[PDB]
Paper text:
The most relevant are the cysteine peptidases gingipain K (alias Kgp) and R (RgpA and RgpB), which cleave proteins and peptides after lysines and arginines, respectively. Kgp, which is responsible for most of this activity, is a 1723/1732-residue multidomain enzyme encompassing an N-terminal signal peptide, a pro-domain for latency, a caspase-like cysteine peptidase catalytic domain (CD), an immunoglobulin superfamily-like domain (IgSF), between three and five hemagglutinin-adhesion domains, and the C-terminal domain for type-IX secretion. Taken together, these domains form an elongated structure that resembles a tooth: the CD forms the crown with the cusp at its top, and the IgSF, which is a six-stranded antiparallel open β-barrel, shapes the root.
Here, we analyzed the crystal structure of Kgp from P. gingivalis strain W83 in complex with KYT-36 to very high resolution (1.20 Å). KYT-36 is a L-peptide-derived molecule that mimics a substrate binding in extended conformation to cleft sub-sites S3, S2, S1 and S1’. Its side chain penetrates the specificity pocket and its aliphatic part is pinched between W513, A451 and C476 through hydrophobic interactions. The terminal ε-amino group is tetrahedrally bound by D516Oδ2 through a salt bridge, by N475O and T442Oγ1 through direct hydrogen bonds, and by Y517N and W513O through hydrogen bonds mediated by a solvent molecule. The carbonyl carbon is just 2.02 Å apart (2.00 Å and 2.03 Å in the two Kgp molecules A and B found in the asymmetric unit of the crystal, respectively) from catalytic C477Sγ, which is roughly perpendicular to the carbon and its three bound atoms.
Author numbering: 229 to 681
Write the structure that this text describes.
């Protein structure tokens, strides 16, 4: 089925192709440094290069060739990071949506399924890009002083006379029944199923890890209950950054005449989100229902886990897959596609959904699920020079990276017995303090150093 045909794109060693506007080189450096340190092999290019060019056609041809060449060399990019707004990386009009999309940078072969997990760090200045990066770094390095905010979420079934009861409430209730609850470590599940909505956005200030709104959207707002771009600029959630998902119309229409809601919520300084998932064109009640809960969901009838396929909430909470921000969006789109394949009621079609939904901000983040766990590991006392690999022990599934000065030297995944064989693509030939980073989905990172010589 579509789930086995097009599963989670995450793979290791993690590879990321970055295409950025030339003005962002200095601001982007701390983000590239951290991504290399945590084990991403980066291939970084700018719109001032001959091979990239400055047009949709040249940038797309560049990306497609990089993917195809990487795949031929058993080294396909996993992620595609687009850095800049539409003045530097334009996107193009969707065939189905008639609105801007980044899909065709990611969709390399003939179909409408991406080859890479794509996200856009949309900024209008280096300062706005730094704003996004600082939130990502605090979240991924887990340097926030109030980690308890990670145990809290905000879920809203917004206003619609007919659809709030038929789809909005069943969507949020399914999320709460199976995942956003005390049994999964969430101490505060702020939820608004219907009016009165009064005070529902206060929780974005006090602290939540995740906010999901399903109902009406505009280019610059969650419409009812209302949260505008002007209100996003007045949030006070310093050091308490969230993932937000707007299952609603047009909040991610990132070529709008003003910065769209998804751009503002990620660009705002020391407040708002580290990533946003939303739709560039209108979204639809039926496909958004399946997106969150799974296919085989029925309007006006509460869905259960046994009676639906995998949706975005289900995938998020799988422990061993669908652990990135991009993968949450991917799972939702798979569910909307599966609904069509099995003959459920559909309102607009899968191709439209793959063109519609986007990640703004950093889609490569692995969101925590309530309070992340403390990892176990053993570092060797030394790293002998000129070795093809090193063993590092860490809990099964952890990803280990050895680097220095923001240059990645080697990576490995801990096997089922907790042994990571770190393959050194660059051997250690010089004395120095080498960084060792260990990450795992829903675990706090380990950031240490080993002295050589
Ligand atoms: C943007 N637009 N909306 C539309 O055209 C509707 C698009 C679209 N129609 C739809 O879902 O239809 C389903 C259906 C199929 C078969 C039968 C009956 C229903 C729709 O309502 N989109 C919704 C999101 C629904 C999914 C939530 N999880 C969208 O956010 C929307 O319409 N926003 C408009 C809006 C903007 C500002 C304030 C209020 C409303 C609009 C703008 C101004 C005036 C009227 C419509
Ligand atoms: Ca494809
Ligand atoms: Ca824009
Ligand atoms: Na499901
Ligand atoms: Na998951």
């Amino acid at each position: 089925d579509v789930y086995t045909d097009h599963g989670d794109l995450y793979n290791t060693p993690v590879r990321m192709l970055v295409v950025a506007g030339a003005k962002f080189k200095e601001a982007l450096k701390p983000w590239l440094t951290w991504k290399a340190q945590k084990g991403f092999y980066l291939d970084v290019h700018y719109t001032d290069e001959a091979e990239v060019g400055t047009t949709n056609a040249s940038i797309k041809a560049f990306i497609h060739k990089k993917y195809n060449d990487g795949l031929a060399a058993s080294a396909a990019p996993v992620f595609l990071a687009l850095v800049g707004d539409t003045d530097v990386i334009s996107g193009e009009k969707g065939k189905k949506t008639k609105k801007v999309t980044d899909l065709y940078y990611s969709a390399v072969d003939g179909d409408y399924f991406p080859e890479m997990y794509t996200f856009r760090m949309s900024a209008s200045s280096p300062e706005e890009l730094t704003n996004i990066i600082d939130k990502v770094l605090m979240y991924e390095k887990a340097t926030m002083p109030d980690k308890s905010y990670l145990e809290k979420v905000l879920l809203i079934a917004g206003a619609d006379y007919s659809w709030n009861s038929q789809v909005g409430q069943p969507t949020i209730k399914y999320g709460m029944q199976y995942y956003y609850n005390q049994e999964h470590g969430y101490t505060d599940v702020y939820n608004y199923l219907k009016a009165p909505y009064t005070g529902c956005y206060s929780h974005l200030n006090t602290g939540v890890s995740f906010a999901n709104y399903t109902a009406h959207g505009s280019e610059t707002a969650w419409a009812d209950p209302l949260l505008t771009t002007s209100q996003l600029k007045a949030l006070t959630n310093k050091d308490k950054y969230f993932l937000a998902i707007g299952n609603c119309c047009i909040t991610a229409q990132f070529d709008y005449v003003q910065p769209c809601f998804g751009e503002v919520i990620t660009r705002v300084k020391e407040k708002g989100a580290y990533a946003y998932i939303g739709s560039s064109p209108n979204s639809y009640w039926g496909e958004d229902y399946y997106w969150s809960v799974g296919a085989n969901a029925v309007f006006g009838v509460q869905p259960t886990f046994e009676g639906t396929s995998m949706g975005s909430y289900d995938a998020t909470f799988l422990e061993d897959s669908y652990n990135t921000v991009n993968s949450i969006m991917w799972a939702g789109n798979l569910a909307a596609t599966h609904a069509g394949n099995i003959g459920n009621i559909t309102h607009i079609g899968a191709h439209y959904y793959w063109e519609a939904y986007h990640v703004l901000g950093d889609g490569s983040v692995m969101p925590y699920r309530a309070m992340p766990k403390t990892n176990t590991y053993t570092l060797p006392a030394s790293l002998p020079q000129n070795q093809a690999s090193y063993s590092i022990q860490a809990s099964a599934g952890s990803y280990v990276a050895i680097s220095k000065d923001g240059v990645l030297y080697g990576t490995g995944v801990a096997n089922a017995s907790g042994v990571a064989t770190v393959s050194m693509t660059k051997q250690i030939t010089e004395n120095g303090n080498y960084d060792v980073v260990i990450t795992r989905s829903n675990y706090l990172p380990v950031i240490k150093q080993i002295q050589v010589g």
